[PDB]
Amino acid sequence: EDSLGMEVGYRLIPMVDFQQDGELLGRIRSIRKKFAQDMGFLPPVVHIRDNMDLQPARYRILMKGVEIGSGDAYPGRWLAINPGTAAGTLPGEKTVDPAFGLDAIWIESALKEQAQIQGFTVVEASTVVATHLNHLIGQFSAELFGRQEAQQLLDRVSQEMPKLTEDLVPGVVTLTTLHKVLQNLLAEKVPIRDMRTILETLAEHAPLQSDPHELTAVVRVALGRAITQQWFPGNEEVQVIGLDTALERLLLQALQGLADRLLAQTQEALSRQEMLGAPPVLLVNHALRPLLSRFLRRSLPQLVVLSNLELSDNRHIRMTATIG
Template sequence: MRARDLSVLVGIIGIVLMMVVPIPIALLDVLLIINISVALLILLVAMNTQDALQFSIFPTLLLVTTLFRLALNVSTTRNILSHGEAGNVVATFGSFVAQGNIVVGFVVFLILVIVQFIVITKGSERVAEVAARFTLDAMPGKQMSIDADLNAGLINEQQARERRQKIEREADFYGAMDGASKFVKGDAIAGIIILVINLIGGLIIGMLFLDKSFSEAAKLFSTLTIGDGLVSQIPALLISTAAGIIVTRAASEGNLATDLSTQMLSQPKLLYIVAGTIAALGIFTPIHWYIALPIAGVLVYAALAMQKNLNRQQVEDEKKEEEQQIEEVRSPESVISLLQVDPIEFEFGYGLIPLADAQQGGDLLDRIILIRRQCALELGIVVPVIRIRDNIQLKPNEYVIKIKGNTVARGELLLNHYLAMSAGYDDDSISGIETREPAFGLPAMWIDEPTKERAELSGYTVVDPPSVVATHLTEVIKKHSHELLGRQETRALIDNVKDAYPALVEELIPSVLSIGDVQKVLSKLLREKVSVRDLVTILETLADYGTYSKDPDVLAEYVRQALSRQITLQYAASDDAMKVITVGPMLEKKIAEAVQQTEHGSYLALDPSTSQLIHHRVTEQVTKAVQSGTSPILLTSPTIRMYLRQLLERTLQDIPVLSYSELEPNVEIQSLGVVNL
C-alpha cells in the first residue's frame, strides 16, 4: 500500500479515535486550526471549479469533514466539562466574539447556526435533490443523443464512451450530493444540541465539582461553549457554502470569478444607473452625501473601465475573426465553399449600384421580394433566393442574369433616363438613344426627364430603369423556371400539400411515383409555361395514371388535360374567340407514323427534309398571324401534341402548342390558318 493511501486510512481511524481517546489541549488547538484551513480550502476550490465533476470527491469529503468536526466537538466538550478549558483557540473565539458579553456571543452563535441550517444547508439540499432528479430523468435523452451523433459519424466510439461515462458520473455525483447534504443538516442540529449540553453540564460541574458560584460557572462555561460552537460552526458554514456553489453551477462554463466578471460586469450602462441611484440617495435623503457620493464615483469609474475593456475586447475579437477568415482561405478545405452554385444571380456594374443601395433610394431588393411573390402566384413554385452582387468586370451600366452560374440574359441601363416604347407609330419630335427592351426585344429608346411627359402624351410606354430590370428578371425566371425546380424544391411543395391532403400524398409517393418522377412532370409543365400552383389536381392525376405509365411525357399530357380550364383561361380572352393555327390531317398523320416506341419511351423519328419542311410551313402561318397583330396558338390532336412541341421547341419555343383535349368545350375557336404538307 502506498504511503498516500495509508495516510488516508490512518487519518480516518484517527478521527474515530478522537471521539473516545482524550486529546491534549495543545494538539486540540492544532486540529481546530487544521479544520478551519480545510474548510477554507474546500470553499476556494469550489469557487474555482468549472465543472462539478472536477470536484467529484466533494460528497465523500463532506462526510469526512463533518465527521472530523463532530470528533473535535466531542474532544472540546470533554475538555470543557472535565477541566474547564478547551485550549487557546476556543477561548480566543469565545472572548473575542462575545467581547465580554455572553448574550452577544450567544446571539452571534445562534445567527450563524440559523443561517447555515435554514438558508444555506436547506437550499443546497433542495438544489442537490432537484439536480439529481433532473439528471436521472435526462439520462435516456442524453444517451439517445450520443447514439445519434455516433451513428451520424460526428463522434467516434471513444468519444461516445467518454460522454456516456460523464453522464453516469453526473448522475452519481448529484445523487451523492443529495445524500451528503443531509450530513450538513444533521451537523447543524448537533451543534445546537452540543451547545445546550455544554451550558447545562458546565453549570452543574462548575458548581458541584469545581466549587464555583453560579455567576462564575455561567461566565466561564458560557464563554467556552460559545467559543467551541463558533470554532465548529464557522468551518461548517464555509463547507455548506461550498456545497451550495458546487450544486448550483450546472449551467456555468467557467469558474466563479470568470462568470462574475463576464456576466454581472458585462453591461457598463447598468453601473451608471446604479451610480445615479446611490448619488440620489446621498443627496435627497438623510444618508450623508460623503458616504454615497464616493461609492457612486467608484461605480462610475468601474463603468468607464469596463466600457474601455469591452471596446478593446471587441477590437481584438474582430482582429481574430479576420485572421481566422484569412486562415480559412489559406486552408485546403476553403476550396469546398467555392463549389456552391447559386440558383439565380443578378450581377451589375458599379454604375448601377444605386439600384440596390437603399440609402441612395434604390428599391431593387423590395422589387425582388415582389417578383418572388408574383412567381409563386403565377407559376406555383418558390423561387430561390436571388444573389445580388456588383461585378467590376462588367461595364458600368451593364447587368447580367445567371442561372446556376451560367449567363442567360444581359442588358444595359441608363439610370437618369427612361425607357420609351412606341405603340406602333413613332413621333419624330421624340428623340433619344436607340436600344431594345431587354425582356422582349422590342425597339425602344432611352429618353431624359424633360422628354418623358411629351412621350407619354404621344402614346409611348415609358418605364423607369428599376421597372425594366424587374420585368426582365421576371421573364427570365418564368422562362427558366423548369431549371429552378429540383427534387428538393419538389419535396418542399409536396410536403406543403401533405399537411392538408395526407391521403393523396401517401398514396402517390413513393408507392406509385418517386419524387424524381413528379419533378420531371412538373418541370415539363413549367417548360411550356403551365402553372403548377394547382398541385392537388396534378397529384390526383398522377395518382390515377401513374399505375399505367411511368413515362413523364405521357403523364404530363394527362396532367395538361386535367388542367384544361386553367390552360383555356390562360390563352383565351373572355370577350373574344381564341385565334389558333390548326394542324392539317396530312401533317398529323405524318407525325403519328414517325413515332417510334421503345422500352425507354417513345420518340419522333423524322428525316431532316421533312422536319425542315414542317418548320417552314409552321413559320409561314405564324408570320402571317403576327403581321395581322395576333399572338397565334398552334392547335393539334392530343396524340401528337407533345411530339409536335418537341419538334418546334428550339426554333418556335414561344408559340404555345395545345391539343383539343386541353380546351374547355364552351370556348370559341377562330382558325387563322392550317399547316399542311
C-alpha cells in the first residue's frame, strides 16, 4: 500500500486542499524538505486521503497501512499547550497534545495572545498535525529509506562523485549491502549527509569485509566527529552515562537471563540525565556498543548508544550517570 499515508475527516479537508486554504498541506512539504536537508535523503510523499468513517476533526497517520498516530485537530481553534509551569485558567476544550502527553486546551483565536501572557505555547491547528507528523517520521526515518530511496541517492552521488561510485558499486559493495549499511545509520539517529566519507570508508574496508554490520561500525567511527557534534555542539562538557567497570566485565563475557535488571537501571540513568540537561547518550566500550544498542533501544528508543572510538578524544568528557 502507501508507505506514508494520512487519513483525515471531512472537517480537515480545507487544510489539505490546495484549491482552498491548505495550511496543513504546505507544512507537510516543509517538513519533508527539512527531512531531506537534515537526514540526507528524500523521504516518500505523504499521500493524503479523505475517510468519511472517521470523526470530522479526526486524522490518522499511516505507514505501510499500519496506523502510527492519530488525534484531534479543530481548524478555527488554537491549541494552547501547557509546559507545566503556566498559570491561570483558560476556557475551551481541555485535551492532550497528540505528539506527546502535555496538557493542552483548544481556545478561540481571540484568546491566543492572552494564553501566551499566562505562559502557554499556542499553535494553530495545522501545526498540531504537522508537529505530530514530524515527530513520527523522525522515529521511522530508517523505515522510510527503501531500496528506491537508496537507488536515487546512489544516482545523486553518481553525479557528484563519479570517481568513487564507478568502482564502488556494484563490484565492491552491492546496492543491497549499501542500503543495509545506510539504514543502520538512520536506525540510530545519525544522518547520511556526508556521502563523501561514507563511500570513501566503504572503498577502504569493504574489499576486506563483507558483513554489513561490521561495515556499519567502521563507517560510524569515520563519522565520529559528526555524531559527537549532533549531541554535543561546540566544545561543551560531554555529559554521558557510563557502565560500571565491573558491569563491562559482565556484558563483555556474555557477548563472548537477568536482562530485566539491566533494563531497570538503564531507565533510572535516563531519568537523572534530565537533571542538569544532558543528552540520553550511553557511552560504552566498542565491543558492547552494537549489542546493547539493539537491545536497550528496543524498549528505550530515545536512548543513544555511543562508542569510545567514535567519540572525539580532544574534548571535555565527563560521566554523569552510572549503571552499576
